[PDB]
Amino acid sequence: MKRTFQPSVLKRNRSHGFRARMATKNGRQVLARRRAKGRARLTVSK
Amino acid sequence: SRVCQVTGKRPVTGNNRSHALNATKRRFLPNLHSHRFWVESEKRFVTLRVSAKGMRVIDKKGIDTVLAELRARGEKY
Amino acid sequence: MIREERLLKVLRAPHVSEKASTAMEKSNTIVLKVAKDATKAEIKAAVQKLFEVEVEVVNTLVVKGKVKRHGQRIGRRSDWKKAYVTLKEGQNLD
Amino acid sequence: AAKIRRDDEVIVLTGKDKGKRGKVKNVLSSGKVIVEGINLVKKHQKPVPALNQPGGIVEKEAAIQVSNVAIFNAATGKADRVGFRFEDGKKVRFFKSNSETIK
Amino acid sequence: KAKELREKSVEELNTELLNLLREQFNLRMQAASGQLQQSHLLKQVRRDVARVKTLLNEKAGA
RNA sequence: UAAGGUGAUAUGAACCGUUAUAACCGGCGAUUUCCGAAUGGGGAAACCCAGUGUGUUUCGACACACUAUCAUUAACUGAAUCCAUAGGUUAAUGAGGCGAACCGGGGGAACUGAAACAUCUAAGUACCCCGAGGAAAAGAAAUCAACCGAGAUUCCCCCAGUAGCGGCGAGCGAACGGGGAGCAGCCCAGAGCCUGAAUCAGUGUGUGUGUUAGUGGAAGCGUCUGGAAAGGCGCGCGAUACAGGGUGACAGCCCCGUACACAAAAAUGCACAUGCUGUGAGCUCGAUGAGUAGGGCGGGACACGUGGUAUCCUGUCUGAAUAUGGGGGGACCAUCCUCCAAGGCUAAAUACUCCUGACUGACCGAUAGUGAACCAGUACCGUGAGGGAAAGGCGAAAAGAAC
RNA sequence: CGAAGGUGUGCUGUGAGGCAUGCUGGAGGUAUCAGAAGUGCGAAUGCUGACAUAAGUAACGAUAAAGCGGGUGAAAAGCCCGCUCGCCGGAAGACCAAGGGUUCCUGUCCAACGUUAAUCGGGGCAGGGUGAGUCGACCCCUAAGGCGAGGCCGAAAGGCGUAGUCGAUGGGAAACAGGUUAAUAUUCCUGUACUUGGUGUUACUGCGAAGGGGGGACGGAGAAGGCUAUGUUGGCCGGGCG
RNA sequence: UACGGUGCUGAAGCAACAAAUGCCCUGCUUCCAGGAAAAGCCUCUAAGCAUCAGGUAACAUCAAAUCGUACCCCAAACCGA
């Protein structure tokens, strides 16, 4: 059965990666929040 | 953005009150208009998005003065 | 023209292994560990100056670091660049 | 400003080797000294083929707290406390009892 | 060694630095093999190099 | 500052060092890969690809600098179009991004309460957005008061759950006046005289006093139990030091400290003192903020829900007088009193703690206390935003059990 | 000369409780009278951990299938070698993309992991292994679409979009056969090739773009004909005479 | 012969027939539903430069960097604990 997650690296990056996040204000905010939290992996970026 | 260039009139929020006093948020836009103003000193038309009040002000003072004021404020025309 | 200083920095070590040995013996090709940033030409230059030996050609590759586990904690070894440097016929290297 | 040092003869104030004496062998950063012949332990040394160690019950010198030893003044025939003072633009230790400089 | 190396020219310094670098390289070469049984040497050499660099910087625009 | 060192799990190896460039600590420097505002262009962050110029070359190539955008100012250039302007190319200066709370402004809910619900409440709260500062905002009466007077703003206690507002329901809720904290007033609308007169900012110098390493720093022995004494029992001594912590059980006198007394080559905060740069004080004459005040229509703010509703703000349409004048005194008028709007600046008392140091606790002591005493915002879960654990203790000493 | 805590015993109070003491424990406890409360648990399909029950029960994951000999070993139904047997064969074979990221190869170890055992393993530990001018990416070009100087628009945030600049899943130069490693190969070696750049040359002599034109450059279905991959048979060559 | 393999050696190496859904074929025939773009590539000149550069001609030499390359890939290695 075709399950929901069907990985594709480029797609992932474009969607969720650092640059995408940077591009918008909300993305930036998210990043900031993550930083505040103390996340080790700030984004999906490898 | 709906802003009189002479006066600085922006939109302001407010309410529609009904007969049953049902407040609902609304705006009050200014009565803006893009108008070519003849500038006698420079001998050219300067277009300005201005309120009717702005126009009145201009009439009162002189366009030149208004222009000067605008310049002082750091506003292009 | 590569700078002397740069050249010295390029070459990290000789690589000892069965394959390397074979290369040395049969094909007249030395297997070096080099700086990860070191390009082929630079490597060649280094070889020529620092070992005093004519170079035919340099093949490089990047070796990826193995992931290991020291007790409970996970940790990755560093990547490093390997270079097969083929010396010209009759060139004997100390 | 460390009152006990490498080559000082000291006397032990407390423990199993209390009253005994011995030259400080070396002093550790942890605030402990190892004194010659004082605090002894019979370690069971595990043999290793490399490094030429046979492995046996080796009696070695364990550390002792610096607080537990005291610098011995040979003149008084007793343990003393150490003070610090400047003689000829140079800091030196002295025995509190009798006020003489440590040399 | 810095007080001794301070009393030198730029050219002189450069040559010295080069020599040091060479030495370091040699050590590295040896180290990789089973030749070098004096590890501290490497540490020393790097330090020396650093010192030389510092001196050079001091000389040229400081 | 030193006789010991080369951070930790974590030993070892190879070494350095011992009276002074070992190590350690502090000031000022130097170096400071790539990504990131990221800024030479691009991009699937930590990668890809340039251009220009200046130097070098063993002539294969190297090196190192510059090259974002916007704003502002300047220079040169420059359309339709004659002059111009738009535009264009350079140059200089500034900005950009991040950050706990507090602060001002622009927008702005609903659950809920009203024992239903729509006015109302929740609440100008949550949240989003812009901007700033160490605080911000406000601030020098077109203010109150009551025929007596007070004298800018801010903050605290009262006044008072009063007067009011209010489907006169639920609820909301002042002010006057009083007591305090702190107190400071100035300039431009403009020209005359006199000319450097107070004050403020930047910036050197000097003095004082912090801060960033540090230094000295008192006095205890015997004996019994015991694995060990700091405990018991004796007899002493210090105390401007009996804070606290450690040390083989509970130590004023073993150690580190503590009281107390001193310390800075260098950097730097704050006070005054002083030099330089800009800034103009005092005097006389005036002048005295117009699409403004008011008004109509619509909204919002004032405790005040349009009500008999003063006052403030303005989206809309109007529109004075201008000191012989105008504003206010809670509809409105008359009298009196009181103030001078339509330009600005302004310390203090007030708000907060991402962070630094010191000290305290009828606060917790591992299911508690932070989510996190432990390599935790980790593992793990989730496309992602996001969620998010568990897990402390040998012994005094590894003497961690040779054979 | 043994604190709290743990665990027995005895006594005692109307009760919540209290006192004493043996063992364990190895360092803290605290009268009295006051003071303050995270002050008392059997229940909340309460929360967390631990441990039961069913129960040594069901199951051990395709009904493609095993058997024997030898080996190694502490031990072999399962590992290695061998000979049989059986199953797939438009796949259950071979090679890639995507995705994973060392699982590859060698040695070594069998606690845990493997639904049993395990000497074996995609498990543990150590070491080794990925070689390109011509394969792919990068690179040049663009599609859908994205971003977008100025710009237009919008309370703010921001929206749309020109010039541009990104964006493959499409267009764009070039390599083949054999041999080799325990593990790489159109990458190493052997042979035989090709490409498009510079630089220098001699020979010639109109070169030059952000522009013009051509080209690149394109649908579905159908029909053949010519071919090759590949296969079959014969010939040939080597071996065979059951 | 370390039973893994290593080194040497090496005959013939033709023909016919059959034959793709692969190639000629981005072709041809036909149909209507009428079938990317841009660069590389060829060519034309403009401003320009002018007896220089640039172009094509062979020949010589140098050049081709960087990153990927193991292994699984209808699966015990990817998505399904």
Distance from C-alpha of C8 to C-alpha of E46, rounded to nearest angstrom: 13
Domain that holds residue E60: 1-62
Give the count of alpha carbons within 13 A of D99, CB side only.
1
C1 CB less than 7 Å from any atom of strand H: no
Distance from C-alpha of A30 to C-alpha of A27, rounded to nearest angstrom: 5
Quote the tokens at residue D37: 């012949």
Nearest-by-Cβ selection for C14 from E21, E24, E32: E32
**3-class SS of residue D37:** coil
- Tell me which chain C residues have a C-beta less than 8 angstroms from the C-beta of E24: 8
- State which fold the A1-46 domain adopts: Helix Hairpins (1.10.287)
Please give the tally of structural domains in chain D. 1
Chains in touch with D (3+ beta-carbon pairs under 8 Å) read none
This PDB structure is determined at a resolution in Å of 10.0
Mutant choice from C8, C10, C16 vs E, greatest count of E C-beta within 10 A: C8
Please give the tally of structural domains in chain E. 1
Please give the tally of structural domains in chain C. 1
Give me the residue spans of the domains in chain B.
Answer: 1-77
Find all residues with CB under 8 Å of C43, minimum gap 6, and list them.
C10, C11, C32, C34, C58, C60, C83, C85
Q: Which amino acid is at E6?
A: R
Residue C86's nearest CA partner among C63, C62, C59, C61 is C59
Cα Rg of chain C, angstroms: 15
Torsion of CA A10, A14, A16, A20, to 10 degrees: 150
- Tell me which chain E residues have a C-beta less than 8 angstroms from the C-beta of C13: 28-29, 31-32
Distance from C-alpha of B75 to C-alpha of B54, rounded to nearest angstrom: 15
Domain that holds residue C64: 2-94
